[PDB]
Amino acid sequence: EPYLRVPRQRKTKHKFNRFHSDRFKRVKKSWRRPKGIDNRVRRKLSGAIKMPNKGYGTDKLAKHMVHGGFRLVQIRNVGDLLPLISQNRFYCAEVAHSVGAKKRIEIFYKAMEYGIHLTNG
Amino acid sequence: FDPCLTAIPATFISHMRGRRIVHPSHSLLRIEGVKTREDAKFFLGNGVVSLYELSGKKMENRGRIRRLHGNSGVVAAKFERNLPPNKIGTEVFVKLYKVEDDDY
Amino acid sequence: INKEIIVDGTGHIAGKLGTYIAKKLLEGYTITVLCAESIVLTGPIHRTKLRYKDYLNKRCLVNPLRGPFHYKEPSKLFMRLVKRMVPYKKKRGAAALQRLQVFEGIPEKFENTERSICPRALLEYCANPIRKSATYGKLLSEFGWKHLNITEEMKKKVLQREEKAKKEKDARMEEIQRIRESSSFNKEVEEIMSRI
Amino acid sequence: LEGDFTARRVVFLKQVENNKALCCGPAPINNVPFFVIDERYLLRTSTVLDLKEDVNIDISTVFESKRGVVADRMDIDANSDQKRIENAIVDAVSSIRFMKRYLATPFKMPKFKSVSSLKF
Amino acid sequence: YKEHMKKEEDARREAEARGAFYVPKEPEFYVVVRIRGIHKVPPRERKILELIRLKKPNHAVFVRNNAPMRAMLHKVRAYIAFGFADIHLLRTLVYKRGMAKVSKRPLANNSSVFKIGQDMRLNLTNEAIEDHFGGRIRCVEELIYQIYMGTDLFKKANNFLWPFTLCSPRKGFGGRKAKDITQGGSTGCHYDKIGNLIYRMIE
Amino acid sequence: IKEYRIYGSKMPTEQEVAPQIFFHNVFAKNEIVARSRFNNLMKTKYKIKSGKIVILKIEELVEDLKDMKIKNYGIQLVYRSKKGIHNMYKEFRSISRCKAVEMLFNDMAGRHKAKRDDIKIVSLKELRSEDLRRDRVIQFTKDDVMYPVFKKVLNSKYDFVLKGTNIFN
RNA sequence: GCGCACAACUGCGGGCGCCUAGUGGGCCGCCGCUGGUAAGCAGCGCCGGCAAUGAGGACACAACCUCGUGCGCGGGCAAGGGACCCCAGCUGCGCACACAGACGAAGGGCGCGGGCGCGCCCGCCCCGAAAAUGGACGGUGCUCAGCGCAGCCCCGACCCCGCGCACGCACAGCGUGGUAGGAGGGCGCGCCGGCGCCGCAGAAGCGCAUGCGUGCGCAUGCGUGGAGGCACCCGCGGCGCAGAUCUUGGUGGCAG
Numbered sequence A: 001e002p003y004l005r006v007p008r009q010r011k012t013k014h015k016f017n018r019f020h021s022d023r024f025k026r027v028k029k030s031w032r033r034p035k036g037i038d039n040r041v042r043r044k045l046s047g048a049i050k051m052p053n054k055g056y057g058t059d060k061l062a063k064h065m066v067h068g069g070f071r072l073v074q075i076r077n078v079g080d081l082l083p084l085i086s087q088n089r090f091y092c093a094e095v096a097h098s099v100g101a102k103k104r105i106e107i108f109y110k111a112m113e114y115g116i117h118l119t120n121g
Numbered sequence B: 001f002d003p004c005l006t007a008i009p010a011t012f013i014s015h016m017r018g019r020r021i022v023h024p025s026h027s028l029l030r031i032e033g034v035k036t037r038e039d040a041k042f043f044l045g046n047g048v049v050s051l052y053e054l055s056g057k058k059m060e061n062r063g064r065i066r067r068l069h070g071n072s073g074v075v076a077a078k079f080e081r082n083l084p085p086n087k088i089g090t091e092v093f094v095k096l097y098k099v100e101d102d103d104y
Numbered sequence C: 001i002n003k004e005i006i007v008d009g010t011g012h013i014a015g016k017l018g019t020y021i022a023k024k025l026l027e028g029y030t031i032t033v034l035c036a037e038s039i040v041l042t043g044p045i046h047r048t049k050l051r052y053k054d055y056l057n058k059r060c061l062v063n064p065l066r067g068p069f070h071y072k073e074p075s076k077l078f079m080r081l082v083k084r085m086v087p088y089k090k091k092r093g094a095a096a097l098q099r100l101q102v103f104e105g106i107p108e109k110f111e112n113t114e115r116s117i118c119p120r121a122l123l124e125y126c127a128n129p130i131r132k133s134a135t136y137g138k139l140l141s142e143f144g145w146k147h148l149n150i151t152e153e154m155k156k157k158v159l160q161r162e163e164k165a166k167k168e169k170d171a172r173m174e175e176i177q178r179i180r181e182s183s184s185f186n187k188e189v190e191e192i193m194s195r196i
Numbered sequence D: 001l002e003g004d005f006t007a008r009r010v011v012f013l014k015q016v017e018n019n020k021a022l023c024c025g026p027a028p029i030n031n032v033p034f035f036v037i038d039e040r041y042l043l044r045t046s047t048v049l050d051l052k053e054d055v056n057i058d059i060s061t062v063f064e065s066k067r068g069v070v071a072d073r074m075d076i077d078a079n080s081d082q083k084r085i086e087n088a089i090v091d092a093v094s095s096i097r098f099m100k101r102y103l104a105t106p107f108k109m110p111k112f113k114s115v116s117s118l119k120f
Numbered sequence E: 001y002k003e004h005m006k007k008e009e010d011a012r013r014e015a016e017a018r019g020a021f022y023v024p025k026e027p028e029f030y031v032v033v034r035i036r037g038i039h040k041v042p043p044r045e046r047k048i049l050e051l052i053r054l055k056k057p058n059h060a061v062f063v064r065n066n067a068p069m070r071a072m073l074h075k076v077r078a079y080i081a082f083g084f085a086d087i088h089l090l091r092t093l094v095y096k097r098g099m100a101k102v103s104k105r106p107l108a109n110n111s112s113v114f115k116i117g118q119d120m121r122l123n124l125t126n127e128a129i130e131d132h133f134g135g136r137i138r139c140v141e142e143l144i145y146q147i148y149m150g151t152d153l154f155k156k157a158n159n160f161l162w163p164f165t166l167c168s169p170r171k172g173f174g175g176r177k178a179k180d181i182t183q184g185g186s187t188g189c190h191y192d193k194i195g196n197l198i199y200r201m202i203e
Numbered sequence F: 001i002k003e004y005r006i007y008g009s010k011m012p013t014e015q016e017v018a019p020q021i022f023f024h025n026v027f028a029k030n031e032i033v034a035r036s037r038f039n040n041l042m043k044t045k046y047k048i049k050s051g052k053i054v055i056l057k058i059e060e061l062v063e064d065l066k067d068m069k070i071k072n073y074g075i076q077l078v079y080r081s082k083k084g085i086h087n088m089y090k091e092f093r094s095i096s097r098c099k100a101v102e103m104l105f106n107d108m109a110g111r112h113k114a115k116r117d118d119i120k121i122v123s124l125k126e127l128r129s130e131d132l133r134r135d136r137v138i139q140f141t142k143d144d145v146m147y148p149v150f151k152k153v154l155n156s157k158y159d160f161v162l163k164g165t166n167i168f169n
Numbered sequence G: 001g002c003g004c005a006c007a008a009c010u011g012c013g014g015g016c017g018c019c020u021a022g023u024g025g026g027c028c029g030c031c032g033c034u035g036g037u038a039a040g041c042a043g044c045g046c047c048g049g050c051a052a053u054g055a056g057g058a059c060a061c062a063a064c065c066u067c068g069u070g071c072g073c074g075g076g077c078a079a080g081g082g083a084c085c086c087c088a089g090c091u092g093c094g095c096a097c098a099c100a101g102a103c104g105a106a107g108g109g110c111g112c113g114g115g116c117g118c119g120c121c122c123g124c125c126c127c128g129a130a131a132a133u134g135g136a137c138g139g140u141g142c143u144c145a146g147c148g149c150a151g152c153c154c155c156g157a158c159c160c161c162g163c164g165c166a167c168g169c170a171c172a173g174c175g176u177g178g179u180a181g182g183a184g185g186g187c188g189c190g191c192c193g194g195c196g197c198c199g200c201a202g203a204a205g206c207g208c209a210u211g212c213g214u215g216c217g218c219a220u221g222c223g224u225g226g227a228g229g230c231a232c233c234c235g236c237g238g239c240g241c242a243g244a245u246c247u248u249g250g251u252g253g254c255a256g
């Protein structure tokens, strides 16, 4: 189904939760680089969790790819379907969340006319 | 089809490891009757299968004997999926045909 | 693979037998050790008794109910040896220790079984005959193990029954050999290979 | 070693494209049809039959046995040239004394004592 | 190469045909392998390993058999293994692991304008040699010859070779590698037995 | 280890066109220790340091073991302990000269903890049986000497075997 | 002014200016010292380290040894090891018997093994050798798991090599640790000037999922909700919290 099959190639299945976000509910899981003087994650001691680096970054051309080779496109109305008509195979289209059900009907019908794959429907 | 009909059983004894750090992609196997390093050269490149059950459904995890290990016929094998440390002490079956590092 | 070993413990150095036992146990073997009163400790007996008295001295002062337990049986003392040759606090080492069963003498459950030896752990192979040595039952009968004589008597009655059955069995191996060498058997055998 | 049959002494005919090999343990003898498997799964034994016939057969419809699947293939087919070259190795097996029992018997692993004992 | 080596053997056996002792002219270069790592190096010894272009262990270079270079090799002899390569070790080091230090030239018709601080480590192709030495040398063996026979082109030929990023040796160093080979280590003058390390280090 | 005869001299200059040639017979691990043991003797007997030495020749003295009998060797050595430097005379029976010094090195290490580098050999002489001074090596010079083996040795590599199996014989 | 001319080796781009931070308690090792009976004491010199340097090996262990360090894969190794814990060992030659190896002195030992001239010398062992919770060659244990040696082999780091990717660079390539600290580019928040839009056919918010993302975070699905909101470009800023015996509010355990 994609034009070119891009493998997933995320360099780790790690999530990089924040340090001690397991132990404290005040510490949310969004990553903060720990800056303490004795902190075992900053010091990169063995047994500590890993910190995000440049090295974990996925490939430039594989980045932000969905369903193999596709790239997501936000759609708010039927006018957004028109620049996707020529490039059907490159983009999976996604209707925005705040689009109402009346306009989602008209997006859904024009997308199957223009042959655009909708991830919402 | 019994695995012991055509394949030689080998016990999964350890992962390839340091004293503490363990590299689980390479599994150390002790083939029965193989007791020296030159005896285990007969099994370099040979395919190996680890047979297990997931929810009662039989699975084959296939691998390749990659390198020798030590002077006592222990060989290191790399499988499709890494062997769990639960299966240490259980048997895996060493095939009599060579497979390649790309194609198990 | 038959991964079940029954070890006869006589003439074996204790820690040298224990390493080959524990290395088998961590590979999934089930080892049973018989005749554990005859497992040998090298060196003179008085040095070995001082090592035991050093063991008996170690106990929890606060509460000896939870202290280092002191074993007077040769089976539990040999089990204590192999216990720390495995990682017994981890689940991999404790599961391996469940595959040991160590006994004094030969219980009648192990009548007519096929017993093994570790030749690299034998005293006649490892030790010099000039050096002294003593068994577990020689030591522990002076530290509260009262069952040395009843072990050896019941050991003998097992060995006499097994020597009797071996006297019968090898005669059957004798007669089957004399039958299979007979020309009546051979021409019976080549007649079947003729038809195949 | 790894096929539908997977412990069956067969005889090797011809190496086919995409790494395959034509084999037939003769279907009168061992109830094994013509097949192609991967080249590697054939463990080579030292004894060779004296087959003089050409093995360039119409391979287009021969049942190919994959590795893990034991998928129940359809039974025997028309066998235009397969009947001739089967009878030639029934001719070859009849010359050698115990070779008929050999190809009929499923393979057992030799009792391991050394790798010298694994010569075949 | 064969004629030069045959002439020395004929010179040597003719000398022992008489009573004499003949040792040839010792080679025009040393081959030097960095044994110790980059840590805990005093500033003089760290500087000499920079001027020998030995910036990591298991790196190998050729240095000239000079009187100043011999004194440089002596002061860092606790960090290096050096000796004499013959023509087989010279050619194996360059043909199997030989890269060129090439400056970029942005204009085709003008080889005089180029970049100073950025030198690329590229393959030792004939055209890289023909561009550096302005038509005077244009093959790899002709670069070996300036190394082997120590010509006037030695300094240009040796510097054109990137330092040999060798592997660590097969079968190990066989002991405690930091001490001298006269004490059982692997660190010092391996006078002509330097191939016993380096041949194990190439692959 | 090996035996080396290493020839060397002062490097010839215009002042001294043919310097005196010296040679040393070294039992060394390789030629680099053999050059090292040669350079110290030129530094300490004469005053020629190693920068001004040319090593003219290094040859491997190897004996022909054509029919391979056992000879007797008397070794005069000088070994340095932790406490001092001493003279010793040891007698060995061996195959070659280079094997007898290997018996010297393993014996001085076993009996005196003298390492190989702590030992300098004054002379190694192959001896008659009549000239041997050690009565322990004299006992094996007698013809028709015989003894049994009392040490048990295994006949394979075993981890566990049944009781009936012969392992020693 | 004319003429001559590129000067040992090796490496390699270099010079200078401006603004500004942090720092100004250090500590450790090596070698060399000073004071002191000494000190894990105090004070110096040189170099290296820790601080700020992970990882491997040291039983654990800021500094020792190896050795640097993006994310992986493959190889080869280092230090250190190869009875079992615990990855990896076999072949030979010695030596030692003391709950030794496993803290030690002067002084000793017809203890054993070598050597020299009864006395010396060298190895191992012994005596000298006594502490308070029970207990530490790390443990098990080991008397060829001790003390020595040789041969061949093996294991073992993020080291080295090779490959791939990420990021940085002046980009046929090279590089990649980091406290205090500086810099760059983004993510996020309230509102502004615009510009594209969305919403009672259900906005924000919320809950649970899925996806994207190195990461800050983003998007969607379902549920809830019931009226607003989003994206981008700009501009303004009371703009991002785990800490402050923080503030306020709520709630636990304690505790029926």
Ligand SMILES: [Mg+2]
Pocket: none
């Ligand atoms: Mg202090």
Ligand SMILES: [Mg+2]
Pocket: G053
């Ligand atoms: Mg470091």
Ligand SMILES: [Mg+2]
Pocket: none
């Ligand atoms: Mg560390």
Ligand SMILES: [Mg+2]
Pocket: none
């Ligand atoms: Mg550590």
Ligand SMILES: [Mg+2]
Pocket: none
């Ligand atoms: Mg290796």
Ligand SMILES: [Mg+2]
Pocket: G086
């Ligand atoms: Mg092991």
Ligand SMILES: [Mg+2]
Pocket: none
């Ligand atoms: Mg690196």
Ligand SMILES: [Mg+2]
Pocket: none
């Ligand atoms: Mg960085």
Ligand SMILES: [Mg+2]
Pocket: none
């Ligand atoms: Mg910072």
Ligand SMILES: [Mg+2]
Pocket: none
């Ligand atoms: Mg907003």
Ligand SMILES: [Mg+2]
Pocket: none
């Ligand atoms: Mg936003």
Ligand SMILES: [Mg+2]
Pocket: G238
């Ligand atoms: Mg504020």
Ligand SMILES: [Mg+2]
Pocket: A026, G242
């Ligand atoms: Mg808070």
Ligand SMILES: [Mg+2]
Pocket: G243
């Ligand atoms: Mg904070």
Ligand SMILES: [Mg+2]
Pocket: none
């Ligand atoms: Mg309360």
